[PDB]
Symmetry: C2
Subunit: 177 residues, 2 copies
């Protein structure tokens, strides 16, 4: 008989992305994002116990119909998103990030949603910390904005696991890394 | 009874794109690109009678030697444009072309010609085979776009390689 089980915990991105690869407009526009009832978002929430936010995403989106009762039922964890006024970009200590993420992964629990904002997401991808990419690719080309993939140093090969199409023309592809 | 039919001719992109939006590496790398017999490429070729190239892209692929796919490709009429590409000249060349009767048109390459036609509102279908690869740098399919383009998704096909071809109409 079984004496122990470890299901390894996963950090998961679940987001809308444009066809030209932007998760958000250049001034934070997300009007083009489409919430569809069949995206498996309730079922995705049930598979997570934690949500990661950087300070700027937490202070805006992070504390406020039924989806929001589930969302806010999750344990919330907040990273620093210092703004460097030199170049007006987010600045992180990557060693702190890895320490904090490992401290979390040490604990028992289910999966972890990396919520935002855009700069923190990007940083997690480039630290090799995202296990699963649930990408709702919208039938729009924004022309400019905040990219999902930026400052990528080598090829990231992915495994496609799910492909889902909606009446809206949105195609969700789920990739495991 | 019928006296005339016109099927309006479509200019179509059919290419491999990475997950992060690149149709080629920095230095022209297409090593990552996957060719599947189930991509409907025989059928796409049968629906076109014309292929558009830039001079740089024609020298590379325009007379390349499945050798049965290439026999079909080479059976098409070819327009080779010269080069920057100037907007007015392409528009004029394309309007001259669209005067003629016949089937659809494959915009083949290269990256800069593809971009010229896109930003001129000249691409009607985008057959995008998205590879499960983040290339990290290269030539983007969508580069220097001045307004939102809204698309109608018409087909989504998956492959055992993890490639996903989504077909879009610019309406
Ligand atoms: Cl943030």
């Amino acid at each position: 008989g079984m004496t122990n089980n470890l299901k390894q915990r996963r950090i998961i991105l679940d987001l809308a992305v444009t066809l030209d690869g932007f998760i958000e407009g250049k001034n934070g526009e997300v009007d083009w994002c489409i919430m569809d009832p069949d995206m498996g978002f309730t079922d995705f929430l049930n598979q997570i116990d934690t949500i990661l936010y950087g300070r700027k995403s937490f202070d805006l989106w992070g504390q406020y119909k039924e989806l929001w009762k589930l969302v806010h039922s999750k344990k919330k964890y907040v990273f620093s998103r210092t703004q460097n006024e030199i170049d007006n970009q987010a600045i992180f200590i990557n060693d702190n990030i890895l320490e904090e993420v490992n401290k979390l992964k040490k604990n028992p629990g289910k999966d972890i949603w990396l919520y935002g904002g855009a700069s923190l997401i990007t940083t997690f991808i480039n630290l090799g910390l995202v296990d699963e990419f649930r990408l709702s690719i919208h039938p729009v080309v924004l022309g400019e904005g905040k990219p999902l993939f930026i400052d990528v140093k080598q090829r990231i090969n992915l495994k496609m696991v799910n492909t889902r199409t909606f009446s809206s023309g949105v195609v969700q592809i789920v990739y495991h890394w």
